[PDB]
Amino acid sequence: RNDRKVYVGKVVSDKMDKTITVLVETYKTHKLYGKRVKYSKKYKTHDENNSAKLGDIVKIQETRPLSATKRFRLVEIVEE
Amino acid sequence: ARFRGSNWKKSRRLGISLSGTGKELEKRPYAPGQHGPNQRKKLSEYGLQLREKQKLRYLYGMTERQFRNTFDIAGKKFGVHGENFMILLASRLDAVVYSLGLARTRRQARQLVNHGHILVDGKRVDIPSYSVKPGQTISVREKSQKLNIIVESVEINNFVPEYLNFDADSLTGTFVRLPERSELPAEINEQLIVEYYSR
Amino acid sequence: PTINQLVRKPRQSKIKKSDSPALNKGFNSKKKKFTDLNSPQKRGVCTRVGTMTPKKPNSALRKYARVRLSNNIEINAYIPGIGHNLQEHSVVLVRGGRVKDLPGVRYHIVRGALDTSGVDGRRQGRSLYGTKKPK
Amino acid sequence: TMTDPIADMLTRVRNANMVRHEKLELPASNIKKEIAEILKSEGFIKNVEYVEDDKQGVLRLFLKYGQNDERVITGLKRISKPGLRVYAKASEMPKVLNGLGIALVSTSEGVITDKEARKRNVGGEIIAYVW
Amino acid sequence: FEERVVTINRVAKVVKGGRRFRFTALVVVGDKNGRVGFGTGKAQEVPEAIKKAVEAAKKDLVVVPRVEGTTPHTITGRYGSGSVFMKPAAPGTGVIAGGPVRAVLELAGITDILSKSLGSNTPINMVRATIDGLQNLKNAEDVAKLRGKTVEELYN
RNA sequence: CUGCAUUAGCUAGUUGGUAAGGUAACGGCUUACCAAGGCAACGAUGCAUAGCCGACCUGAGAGGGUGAUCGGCCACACUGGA
RNA sequence: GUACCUAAUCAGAAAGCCACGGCUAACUACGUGCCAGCAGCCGCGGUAAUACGUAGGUGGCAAGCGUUAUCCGGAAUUAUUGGGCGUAAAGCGCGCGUAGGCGGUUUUUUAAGUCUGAUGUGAAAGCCCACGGCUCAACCGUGGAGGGUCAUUGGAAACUGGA
RNA sequence: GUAAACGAUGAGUGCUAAGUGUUAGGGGGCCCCUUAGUGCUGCAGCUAACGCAUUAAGCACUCCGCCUGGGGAGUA
RNA sequence: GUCGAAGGUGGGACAAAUGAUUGGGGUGAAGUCGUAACAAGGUAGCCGUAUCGGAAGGUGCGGCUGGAUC
Ligand SMILES: [Mg+2]
Ligand SMILES: [Mg+2]
Ligand SMILES: [Mg+2]
Ligand SMILES: [Mg+2]
Ligand SMILES: [Mg+2]
Ligand SMILES: [Mg+2]
Ligand SMILES: [Mg+2]
Ligand SMILES: [Mg+2]
Ligand SMILES: [Mg+2]
Ligand SMILES: [Mg+2]
Ligand SMILES: [Mg+2]
Ligand SMILES: [Mg+2]
């Protein structure tokens, strides 16, 4: 089986129902200067049991579109 | 040819005998025209570079476009650019025919090739710009074997460079190998020409 | 600047202005809008033809014409050569090139194109002044 | 505050070299000792001594001055910096002064010169150029 | 020694009567075999200024390290606001340099070089910058001696 | 993979959930119901401009400029809707 | 009945354009006289103009040569490579501080950055290199080489990051 | 909420000849050593020059603010 | 019957053109008035501010030397 992409980030919003927003931080090198700059993307993730809470590190895997904006699911909670 | 003007005036201007005999420079070794006899001011660095380029160009009777294209392809090769340019100029069917001695003049050799008298590897080549490579045999067309011009030129035992190998009996030459800078004209400072094309 | 400053705020090149703005605009009649297109020459109609006094220290009467171009921009175009046939309502080709003496003239009239006649008796640099070979 | 201890080391060497001091002392670190050892190995500096101090240690470098007091080290430059880190692949390793100078490179095989890096086919962070 | 007149300048000193003019000459001197010099001379007449410059240039001659008609390593010669980058080139490259730099490099016997004037274009400061660069040029033998290594050890 | 902050707020099917309908198909895709979310100085929203790319022009290079011909992808077919 | 080939006849039908004070290769005469004009810039022209116009001569190119428009270069004049801020343009009047950027020494560990491989992919055409076909060349064909900030997977661990 | 608000010189850190005065200390024999200020003089180095020079405008690393011909205009 | 192109009506937004008149700017006669700055520029100059005057400018207050003879 081909593998879906997996990301690790911190939950920044738990307000929505059965949903958590996970901020994934990556570095983008400047094309000219060459310095890496911190960049963040919020990924809307499915949390069926409303298990996760703001401030917990989480592992998310890509899925089929589960909503208008939700494309990922919560694999596990790495830290709390 | 292509340039068909006064070869003497061009020799006198460039301070070099294009015929290779000095007949142009014997009586009046100074630039042509009204102000020729009067003193000539010193050439600028650009003036010297241009002079050297024009010397080589008019020696081989080439147009500027073709001269510059030849300079480029020479540059793309391996070794010293200037030398490669000069050997590549010498490898022209024009120059090869002249140096074999099938004609007494470079323009004559050019007309011979251009009018279809010359054979390369048994087949007719009519482009004076044709680039002869080592191992190729230059010959005269079977019909043109008895041309007064060719026979008379061959009778005049012109010195044949070492990189060529001519048989006057058969009117057949062979491009044995690439020329050497030693064998090429000594009046040309190719470095100036490289510099000219640098800027 | 520091590298962090260069990343936060990039280096910015100076934009340049055309010396010949009127040639770089077109007009659409149907949409009634100006079009941005680069043109080497433009046709125009001479609103006025007269002489101008050059900026000091130069002194002369310089021949010029005010031309309404096809894009509808009014400009002052210099008339080169000795003598001209141009009058008001003449149709002319205008190219780029400013006259340094004349303050407002940023264009030249092309000689020997459309209505503009070639300079008569020009025998050197005829192509510049629209004169045919004399022979 | 102090942001680049390596750059400080190279500047101390540069400053002492300008005034033709025989020796210089600096606060020690494992990287700075390794840099010093390469400089002695390449013949840029005479000697390196380490003194335990109960803090971070002290490195003592003895500088080399040729006959006529000609300086063996002409120049030193920090390449990779805290502000902008510089790395090279083994293929892309730079030559300093056409091989007359050296580049000190931090590689997974240790802190080494550019020549060793090309030989071992291991790239890394370019710490400095010394010529 | 070959001599090339880089620039001639008419300079003026103002007096009560008016301006008094003299001519200044900058001349490069070289044997075309690794020794080059520069000198300036001032006189009422250009020939006399040239002559004084030649004598000055001969007094100060700098030895230039050359590796087969090129420089040993890349160098940027800097003097005042004058800056000249010089990079060694392969044979047949020719002298790629502009104005004063060309005169200095040619008379030093360098036939192949890549150069760019990065600073002032004032002739004297360009020349001084060029000379500075050549003075800071080093040869492998000397570097090896200074570093107590063989030339082979220098290159590994 | 684009400019502009003399454009700083934006959004209410909007953000999520539940159920149903609908589609080749996942899905606010749609509709009721429930909750108040979602986006934004890491530039949202607005305004201007533009088909995109393989390439092409220039430059020692790093870069800068451009997107004819040919090939790929997209969009359009008097205008708008079905 | 095209290409090509052969034979016969004929130098006969086949050179123009710009420039020549400096940059920038190439100067004289005559006319004109701050006029007429020239001009990219410095400028030139008011009576002995190598700068205007023409002529002779020369220079640069050539079935082209010039002009205009536009882009890159030269321009290190947005400077990562590769500039600066006492007096030239440029240090906020000065604190307190938030985000961000950056950060002392040692050990252990990890392996995100970093380094080193493998695999897949980055169409073809093009560029580049080589070879081959066209009388040559342009052009055409073929094979390499190159092109990711790429993905996946195996190692190394000094430095940066994490613990 | 602005001044020629000036050292027309951002802040932090380290390094690089000396001589001399002065302010508040510390230490050891009037002298010597030392810490933090405040002046003058002066190498190396730097600078277009003037000058700066352990109170850098020297040699370095970090971060911030600012500049890119003059006028129009600090205007609309 | 729902949805629905076009069309109609309404209050706003933005952009461009034009408008009696008016404001400062620029350029151009060897125009008119004075002489403010550059020397101790004949009251050192300049900076911020306030006020006054045909005009440059004057004066007050604070500041700077990028001034100050003997
Ligand atoms: Mg469009
Ligand atoms: Mg460049
Ligand atoms: Mg003309
Ligand atoms: Mg540039
Ligand atoms: Mg200033
Ligand atoms: Mg301050
Ligand atoms: Mg391809
Ligand atoms: Mg202020
Ligand atoms: Mg003190
Ligand atoms: Mg006064
Ligand atoms: Mg006064
Ligand atoms: Mg009063």
Of residues E94, E98, E102, nearest to B191 (C-beta): E94
Place of tokens 């294009």: B18
Question: Distance between alpha carbon D41 and the CA centroid of its chain, in Å?
Answer: 11
Question: What sign does the dihedral B185-B191-B194-B199 (CA atoms) show?
Answer: negative
Answer yes or no: are the C-beta atoms of C126 and C118 closer than 8 Å. yes
What are the structure tokens assigned to C115, written together?
């209505």
Answer yes or no: are the C-beta atoms of E33 and E90 closer than 8 Å. no
Q: Which amino acid residue lies closest to nucleotide F29, measuring CA to C1'?
A: A68
Which CATH number describes the domain made up of B89-175?
3.10.290.10
Answer yes or no: are the C-beta atoms of D104 and D113 closer than 8 Å. yes
Contact C3 A35 (CB under 8 A): yes
In whole angstroms, how large is the CA radius of gyration of chain B? 17
Domain regions of chain A by residue span: 1-80
Answer yes or no: are the C-beta atoms of E147 and D72 closer than 8 Å. yes
Measured CA to CA, the distance from residue C29 to residue C102 in angstroms comes to 32
What residues contact residue D119 under an 8 Å CB cut-off, 6+ apart? E156
The neighbours of chain E, by the rule of 3 or more Cβ pairs under 8 Å, are B, D
Total structural domains within chain C: 1
Answer yes or no: are the C-beta atoms of E130 and E121 closer than 8 Å. no
Answer yes or no: are the C-beta atoms of B83 and E92 closer than 8 Å. yes
**Which chain A residue has its CA at the smallest distance from C3's CA?**
A33
The DSSP code for E33 is: S
| CA B191 to ligand 6 centroid distance, Å | 58
Spell out a b/e string for A55-76, using b for 16 or more CB atoms within 10 Å of the CB, else e: ebebbbeeeeeeeeebebbbee
Helix, coil or strand: residue E129: helix
What are the structure tokens assigned to B131, written together?
């680039």
Answer yes or no: are the C-beta atoms of E65 and E110 closer than 8 Å. no
Spell out a b/e string for D17-50, using b for 16 or more CB atoms within 10 Å of the CB, else e: beeeeeebebbbeeebebbbebbeebbbbbebee
What are the structure tokens assigned to C65, written together?
């014409």
The three-point CA angle D90-D97-E38 to 5° equals 160
Which chain A residues touch C3 with a CB distance below 8 Å? Answer: 33, 35
Return phi, psi of residue B51, to 5°: -60, -45
The DSSP code for C120 is: T
For the CA of D69 and the C1' of F74, the distance in angstroms is: 73
Solved by what technique?
A: cryo-EM
The DSSP code for D76 is: E
Which nucleotides on chain G have any atom < 7 A from a protein Cβ? 5-7, 16-19, 23-28, 34-45, 53-71, 75-80, 83-85, 100-107, 112-117, 128-130, 135-137, 149, 152-153, 155-160
What are the structure tokens assigned to B59, written together?
């020696």
Closest CA relative to residue B78, chosen from D130, D97, E91: E91
Is the CB of residue E73 less than 8 Å away from at least one CB of chain D? yes
Query: Does any strand G atom come closer than 7 Å to the Cβ of C117?
Result: no
Measured CA to CA, the distance from residue B15 to residue B4 in angstroms comes to 19
Which CATH number describes the domain made up of E75-146?
3.30.230.10
DSSP annotation string for B133-188: -TT-EEEE-GGGTT-HHHHHHHHS-----TTEEEETTTTEEEE-S---TTTS-TT-
